[PDB]
């Protein structure tokens, strides 16, 4: 209705369409260039993070469905 907020679904689809193209694609242009070289010495993001979003001790939810939670 009232309250749009982009980043609902840019957490989606992302949709960089005017988010950052005017002036930050020209350094979009070399990060994809440095991309090819850092992805073939590594990683670039450096995240520890075990599981996939959470552990799962009391989280007995036997769903298994792509059930529509909130993202």
């Given at each position: 209705?009232?309250?749009?907020?982009?980043?609902?679904?840019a957490?989606?689809k992302?949709?960089?369409?005017?988010?950052?193209?005017?002036k930050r694609?020209?350094?979009?242009?070399?990060?994809?260039?440095?991309?090819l070289?850092d992805?073939?010495?590594?990683?670039?993001?450096?995240?520890?993070?075990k599981?996939?979003?959470?552990?799962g001790?009391?989280?007995?939810?036997?769903s298994?469905?792509?059930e529509?939670?909130?993202?």
């Open positions: 209705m009232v309250l749009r907020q982009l980043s609902r679904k957490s989606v992302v949709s960089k369409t005017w988010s950052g193209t005017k694609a020209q350094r979009i242009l070399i990060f994809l260039l440095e991309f070289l992805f073939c010495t590594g990683e670039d993001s450096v995240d520890g993070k599981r996939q979003r959470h552990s001790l009391t989280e007995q939810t036997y298994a469905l792509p529509p939670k909130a993202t």
